[PDB]
Amino acid sequence: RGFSSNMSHSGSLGGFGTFEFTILMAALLNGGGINSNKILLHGFSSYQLFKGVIKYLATMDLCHDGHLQFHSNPASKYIDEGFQTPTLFDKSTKVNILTKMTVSSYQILKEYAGETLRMLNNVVQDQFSNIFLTNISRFDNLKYDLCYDVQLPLGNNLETSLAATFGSMERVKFITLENFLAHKITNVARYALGDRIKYIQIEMVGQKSDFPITKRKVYSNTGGNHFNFDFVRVKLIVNPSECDKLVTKGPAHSETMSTEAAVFKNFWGIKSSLRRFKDGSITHCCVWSTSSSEPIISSIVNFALQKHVSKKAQISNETIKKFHNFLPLPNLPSSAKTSVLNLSSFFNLKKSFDDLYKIIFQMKLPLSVKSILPVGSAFRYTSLCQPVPFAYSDPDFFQDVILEFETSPKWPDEITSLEKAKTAFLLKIQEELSANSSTYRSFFSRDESIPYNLEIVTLNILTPEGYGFKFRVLTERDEILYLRAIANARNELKPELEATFLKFTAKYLASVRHTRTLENISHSYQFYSPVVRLFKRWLDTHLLLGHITDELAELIAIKPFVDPAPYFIPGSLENGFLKVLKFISQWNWKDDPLILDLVKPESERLTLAQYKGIQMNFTNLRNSDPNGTHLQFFVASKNDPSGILYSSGIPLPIATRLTALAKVAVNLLQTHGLNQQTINLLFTPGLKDYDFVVDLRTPIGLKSSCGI
Amino acid sequence: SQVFGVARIYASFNDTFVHVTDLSGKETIARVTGGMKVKADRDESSPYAAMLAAQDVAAKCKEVGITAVHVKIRATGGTRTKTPGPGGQAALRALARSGLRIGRIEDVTPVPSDSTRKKGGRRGRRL
Amino acid sequence: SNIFKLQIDELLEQVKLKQKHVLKV
Amino acid sequence: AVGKNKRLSKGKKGQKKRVVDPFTRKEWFDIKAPSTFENRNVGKTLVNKSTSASDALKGRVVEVCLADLQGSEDHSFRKIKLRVDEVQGKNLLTNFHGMDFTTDKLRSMVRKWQTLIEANVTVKTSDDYVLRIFAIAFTRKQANQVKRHSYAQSSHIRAIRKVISEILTKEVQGSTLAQLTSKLIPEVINKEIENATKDIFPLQNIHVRKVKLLKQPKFDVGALMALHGEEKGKKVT
Amino acid sequence: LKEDIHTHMAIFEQREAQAQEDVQSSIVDEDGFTLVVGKNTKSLNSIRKKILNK
RNA sequence: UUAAUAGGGACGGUCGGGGGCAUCAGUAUUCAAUUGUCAGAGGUGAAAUUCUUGGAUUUAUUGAAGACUAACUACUGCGAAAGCAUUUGCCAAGGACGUUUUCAUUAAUCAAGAACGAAAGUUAGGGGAUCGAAGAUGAUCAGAUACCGUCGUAGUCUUAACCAUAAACUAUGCCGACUAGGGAUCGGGUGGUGUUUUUUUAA
Incomplete structure (x- = not known):
């Protein structure tokens, strides 16, 4: 954690060394509680002695409210009063050992103690390496x-x-x-x-x-x-x-200007102002843009x-500025003034979907509509470029939406007949939609994502607001027919058919779950939204998105947040992004599986039984594939217990290329510190190692139609 | 332009409570009963008490600004009668007579899936 | 817990100072 | 009894005077519903002005019929409870707090010469909103039935109760509450129950009777703002 | 697309109708063995697959 | 030697508000915390004790305690009777039906004795929400409303033993034959049929 016994009032993080650690051992071995009761017993093992103090520093406050007194030469007693500075008083010697502790460093120290205590109490995952064998002070x-x-x-x-x-x-x-x-x-x-x-x-x-x-x-x-x-x-x-x-909220208005108001006006000077809000409160406030x-x-x-x-x-601070600029700037009003934490562009897309969401239900169909589930990238706040009205050159313009009608026994039992019945639904949806609501425009398109399944047809709806939505049927019979598909296949062809089923569930079944969880979790992690696009932007520059499914990048980009240890949850674009690159640099995907708890910060947390099940899957897969040629990245969670759903089919060269760039990126940061020249070097492609390179130019510029 | 209340009427056998509130319910806007408006206790349950009770809130209702009310009539319930008595309906008549815009009428009498033993005993009561 | 205990012991013996360099000082 | 002949009671000595009209201090506050409902306007409420007003505003629960929120009389017999969670500029953001039917519709539903089947399940959604559902169905006679009653054996009631419980657990677990409410409004859930119970027995009037929210996780303003789809004040010149 | 779907459904319905009649037509072996066919069965090919599956 | 439209047992799928041990729900009653308002609330044929300006009654968010399964509830079901109405699991038990399986008279009646036996009652613990013999107290004015109101002990619940009494009724010993038609219902089985159902998961 970069803690030493050196001075901290000078500025360096430190002051807390062995002596401050060991002296606090003896004080607690001689007491420490508010009742002078022993918190540590001398028969405790090394683990128990360390745990209590990591617990002690975490929850008892020694700086603002409360201070501890002990006797070197008498049971140590925790006093409720505090000296407003970190204090471990010694009455026998009349010295406060914590004088070298700065107020700022103490809370940082307390944060590390608490977050390690959570990992120390953790039983599902082993945390030995993170607590001890990972240096967080290098950068x-x-x-x-x-x-x-x-x-x-x-x-x-x-x-x-x-x-x-x-x-x-x-x-x-x-x-x-x-x-x-x-x-x-x-x-x-x-x-x-x-x-x-x-x-x-x-x-x-x-x-x-x-x-x-x-x-x-x-x-x-x-x-x-x-x-x-x-x-x-x-x-x-x-x-x-x-x-x-x-706005930075300040003291409220009063007849006589209060001392808090005095310091408030003096500190910000002209920047200070007295302003009123809709609630009717009058307070001194200052403005930012x-x-x-x-x-x-x-x-x-x-x-x-x-x-x-x-x-x-x-x-x-130019380094943070570069990363913000590398994020595409949308063609919306007041785009430059918009903050990178604002998701207004995504929300306007949802409202347009809601308008079409109402039209579809009131419409009369032979089968009642069970539910319509948007599954597009913009619905989970991950699209590389923010949605822009009528910017249809954006490849993410058409957002996937899953429509599922009420269960019926009249579905064709033949899959090519099954889909031609599915298309017959969308055909009728197109007809009355054109008649009742002429302002909406629509057209059909074919999909070939599912191998060999060449009959799939999707309706692309062009909303009047300037957004596109793509609609496909989901059917309960569809899944079992694929299960029927694998059973009848010849033993040589079964591995091929299960691959077809794998991508079917990736698009239809598991896709719904991925967006539902990610949308909810994204609210807690405000900086997940900006970082994941910039990571995808980084992949595109180096020509990696073509083989990397969008979900895999998302699950990779969320690891530093659900599992931030030994670091803290990122609150910056530069911090979050570099952490993703660091993890890839040190990730041994041949021997170490990647499993995540897609949950909000402290249920759906992986407990021990489900946990052990997932490694058992990894060991079995690696037993058959020790070199990892067939599968490289093992990404699993509650949604994907198999762990091969979003990481299958990637060539080995691309997988090693992904890790290769990350390590050189980390090594680059090591050799040369973060600066403008390095950041440009990170985000530009070599294109030399490729055996042959082909240059293309489109007839027209696609930026303006892309919403950039 | 139409602000709504909830006009709650509790029509007990011996008294009628007319209570007007906000939509959520904790804030009381006006509460009057037959006991407010009658000189003898025997006539508290009388419909005449309910009307002069109901008229009082309605004037007080127009004072705060509420112009419409949702009616939630109820009886004493428990192991007693389930249907509001004549006092409850008479109060509902007066609220219409006052002119307040009546939104919705529902019976919210507490109906027990299981009731404890009644006060009467085995031989019965209400002789 | 036993896994953590053995992990501690492995960690210690990696970082134990060599006794020869002690006798030198 | 305000009569003179009425005897004085003990409380009549200490009488606090009406020297303050309470409504002079009360301040009106506007309520808004989540985006799941078409009509966001669901009225207003009043509270004492801040000396704060917000603390009373948090925990406010308002129960309202769907017909007002949906603008359709087809939902006149259903009610939703909305709990206030956030306040900004006199607009009270609310969240789903419960659902229930009117007493009259339930009473009209229960009829003689048929079997009443009721199933309940305690289940949590993906957002960790622990909730309890109550579902009711009734037996019906066929077109050519000549028997007066349509009773079903106890083994059959158990079989239906197993099927219904599975569907409710599946729907809630694989959905968010906002998504869950989105299914409640069109009453889609009933349609799968009657088709799920179709091969077993013909049922009539299948409805989710009641929804209760037993527990809540940590409040998230960011999620709340998204469901409802910040503001600068005015300089005192 | 309209014509393609309409032709494909019509052909399927005829084949599905013919298959369902074949199974539920009191099939009897040359040795007077009457095949048992359950209600809601539609295709004899499905019956063979069950015998193979089990 | 039969294998009694005698009997026993078996075995197969059902069937039941049959029994016990756990478990889940459910409003309602009382109480408690918070929350907004204010003069009575309660109760009677009429009134008075009683609670209430330390906020009663009523409003909402809950929480706790002990009982108990409304509407669905029917000349319907189970059990020897007394009795038995929420969900789920466990433990065993049972009537009827089916059987081209099994013993071969193993049966009917009946003393003492034994098991069970509504409600009330008894011994010794627990619990005690509601109702409530007893006792207290308010009112003692008026005959259809003429005995009501408030507090309420024992009891009402349960654990381990006693008490064994009911209009515990077909006001009606048991076993076994034969002596009229008719169609409603419950459980099982057989055949037919076309509606509801439904499709290579199973069922």
């Missing part, structure tokens, strides 16, 4: 959602104003200017962002601690014996729920930091 971007590097002015000494701000009063409180500026940056940044973030870390890049014997104090090349740092980096854990809130290139946080940190710390500072 700041992977560990932290947003990073802003601030270049202080005149950096062979800080400007007279900044040196003046430190002033005599703060040497006594804060011995070094590096310590003081970090506290200044934390307080203004914490206060400015407020609820928009969970945790904030301020780090002094290029701070040295060792100097030659010939010299009295450490010398920084920029410092000039004045300031031991090159620059500061503001690292954040953003809160997706309220990160993109347009959303952008498709940057989050609201970049605007707040820039304005807040310039006003208070230094007007000459330079705030820049």
